[PDB]
Amino acid sequence: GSPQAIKCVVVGDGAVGKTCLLISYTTNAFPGEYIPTVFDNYSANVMVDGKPVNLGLWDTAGQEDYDRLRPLSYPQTDVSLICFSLVSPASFENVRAKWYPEVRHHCPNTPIILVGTKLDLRDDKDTIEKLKEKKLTPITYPQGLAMAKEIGAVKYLECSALTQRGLKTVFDEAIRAVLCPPP
Ligand SMILES: Nc1nc2c(ncn2[C@@H]2O[C@H](COP(=O)(O)OP(=O)(O)NP(=O)(O)O)[C@@H](O)[C@H]2O)c(=O)[nH]1
Ligand SMILES: [Mg+2]
């Protein structure tokens, strides 16, 4: 047959690491240094569970200024990654306050993966200490999983675009959430 075409849209607050996640996955290199994007397209031709897939990846802008344009990326979405940074509690709460409602509205009845980004920073002695000074604490795995279940996500996954810990898994699971498994 042909590789199954699967459209995956990536959303979440500005600076949670959406573009880095995509560039790290598709090229194996982490981009130079930060810079907001305005809807870039990426792709991956891969095997998952013995099936070839053409994964089309749609990056989106997290900033509020791009709210009116973001919806143009949603038609025909097969799976959505809702991203939050593990070291930004606000970005976590925005999963329920903003991103889930937006995705559910524009992409009803398609799978969602919840992605906790910047896993390397949850492990950063410094970063922790620094969050502490601000009365913040990183989001834990159980906390993340609970958000996932609240929003009906098929999976909760944690990763670092920088170290690539758990990176491949995010995309294999986004594809698995779409494919029809064996009998
Ligand atoms: N430590 C660390 N930093 C990361 C990781 N991923 C992205 N970052 C950093 O976080 C910042 C934002 O990343 P970026 O991918 O541009 O975020 P975005 O979600 O695409 N922002 P926007 O919605 O504005 O386009 C950059 O400084 C980038 O280096 C990570 O896995 N670990
Ligand atoms: Mg970006």
From Swiss-Prot:
UniProt crosslink position (Glycyl lysine isopeptide (Lys-Gly) (interchain with G-Cter in ubiquitin)): 149, 168
Membrane-protein topology: Lipid-anchor
SUPFAM superfamilies tied to this protein: P-loop containing nucleoside triphosphate hydrolases
Modified-residue entries ((Microbial infection) O-AMP-tyrosine), positions: 34
Modified residues (Phosphoserine): 73
Sugar-modified residues: 34, 37
Locus of motif Effector region: 34-42
Residues that hold GTP according to the record: 14-20, 33-34, 36-37, 61-62, 118, 120-121, 160-162
UniProt record similarity statement: Belongs to the small GTPase superfamily. Rho family.
Disease named in the record: Intellectual developmental disorder, autosomal dominant 48: A disorder characterized by significantly below average general intellectual functioning associated with impairments in adaptive behavior and manifested during the developmental period. MRD48 patients manifest global developmental delay and moderate to severe intellectual disability.
Alphabetized NCBIfam families for the sequence: small_GTP
Name listed for the protein in its UniProt record: Ras-related C3 botulinum toxin substrate 1
Taxon lineage: Eukaryota, Metazoa, Chordata, Craniata, Vertebrata
Encoding gene, per UniProt annotation: RAC1
